[PDB]
Design a protein around this ligand. Structure first.
Ligand SMILES: Nc1nc2c(ncn2[C@@H]2O[C@H](COP(=O)(O)OP(=O)(O)O)[C@@H](O)[C@H]2O)c(=O)[nH]1
Ligand SMILES: [Ca+2]
Ligand SMILES: [Ca+2]
Ligand SMILES: [Mg+2]
Length: 166
């Protein structure tokens, strides 16, 4: 079956690990902290075709690591995650998209913009803001909650669709 290397990026605390854990383990655990910055494998059926998702859950690295750039470079599609209650994390999306563009040597990498923690009423980033940005980038925008499961599988499956139709 086709394997898809998916990479999850974004500021610390936005829910990258929780999104991955929801997809892989089908639960949400407050404040859980993975211990490996590892990859996760899941066999899924998307639009009738079985495939293997290989998910890289990134941690924040503030300096230069050629190894970390090479792990990113193996990725075929990227989730750019911010949290809808965290204005700073939305402002950070630009630097993550620039990083992917640099390491992939391409401006048009399969990508989905993800606004996580949509269960929280205390929104500071309006959906229209992210919709505008996603449309400027030419990529889908999906709102998720790793806590309630809303949008989680759709974010990953939409990313695969973006790879398939790239
Ligand atoms: N309410 C809510 N909390 C979340 C959600 N996703 C993650 N969290 C919590 O936000 C904190 C940071 O999440 P984490 O997965 O470690 O973010 P990461 O640093 O991007 O990997 C943790 O306490 C999570 O339990 C969500 O969708 N809704
Ligand atoms: Ca944490
Ligand atoms: Ca596009
Ligand atoms: Mg994490």
């Amino acid at each position: 079956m086709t394997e898809y290397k998916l990479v999850v990026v974004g500021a610390g605390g936005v829910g990258k690990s929780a999104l991955t854990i929801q997809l892989i383990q089908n639960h949400f655990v407050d404040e859980y902290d993975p211990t490996i910055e590892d990859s996760y494998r899941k066999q899924v059926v998307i639009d009738g075709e079985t495939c293997l998702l290989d998910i890289l859950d990134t941690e924040g690295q503030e300096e230069y690591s050629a190894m970390r750039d090479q792990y990113m470079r193996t990725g075929e599609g990227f989730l750019c995650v911010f949290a809808i209650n965290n204005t700073k994390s939305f402002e950070d999306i630009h630097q993550y998209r620039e990083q992917i563009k640099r390491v992939k040597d391409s401006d048009d990498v399969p990508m989905v913009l993800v606004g996580n923690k949509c269960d929280l009423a205390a929104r500071t980033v309006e959906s229209r803001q992210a919709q505008d940005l996603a449309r400027s980038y030419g990529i889908p925008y999906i709102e998720t909650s790793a806590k309630t499961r809303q949008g989680v599988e759709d974010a990953f499956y939409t990313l695969v669709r973006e790879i398939r139709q790239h």
